[PDB]
Amino acid sequence: LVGAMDLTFVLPLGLFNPVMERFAAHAGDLVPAPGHPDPRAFPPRQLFF
Amino acid sequence: LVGAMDLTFVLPLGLFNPVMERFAAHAGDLVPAPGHPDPRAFPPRQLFF
Amino acid sequence: GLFQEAYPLTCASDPALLRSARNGEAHARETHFAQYLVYDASPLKGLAL
């Protein structure tokens, strides 16, 4: 009666956002120290679980 | 006894807001990366269901 | 067949502007820039669907 499930998962690594959907709400929030460029604006190469 | 409703639906595609009704709220929120024009300021040609 | 009306749906023209609807009717953004939103008046309003 103690059973066993299976589940398979789908995760995207290196996608890019659709052109009409990219922004930063409630204006620019995740801002580094001045004089340092945004690491956010580069195309992503990572994930976190 | 299990019946069926019908409903007909109206959805607009190419409307533009009037002279007065267009604005932004709590000022400029949805702003793209600096050095890029707004995708929001173009006239809309889409919908999303 | 009686009223000769056709009910609107929950719909917007940009998806980022759309996502204030699923929070509820109160926190929905009616209009941000030349885009717009339409929240429904259908009798299926408060349903699970």
Maximum Cα–Cα distance across chain B: 62
Phi/psi of residue C16, each to 5°? -70, -40
> Which chain B residue lies closest to C38 (C-alpha atoms)?
B11
C-alpha B35/C-alpha C7 separation (Å) is 42
Resolution in A for the shown PDB structure? 4.3
The 8-class DSSP code of residue C16 comes to H
Count CB neighbours of A47 within 10 A.
Answer: 9
3-state class (DSSP) for residue C15: helix
Please report residues of B whose CB lies closer than 8 A to that of A22.
Answer: 32-33, 39
3-state class (DSSP) for residue C7: strand
3-state class (DSSP) for residue C23: coil
**Residue C31 · residue C39 · CB < 8 Å:** no
**Residue B10 · residue C7 · CB < 8 Å:** yes
Antiparallel, parallel or unpaired: β C37-38 and C11-12: antiparallel
C-alpha A26/C-alpha B24 separation (Å) is 11
Q: How many CA atoms within 13 Å lie on the side-chain side of B23?
A: 7
Report how this structure was experimentally obtained. Answer: cryo-EM
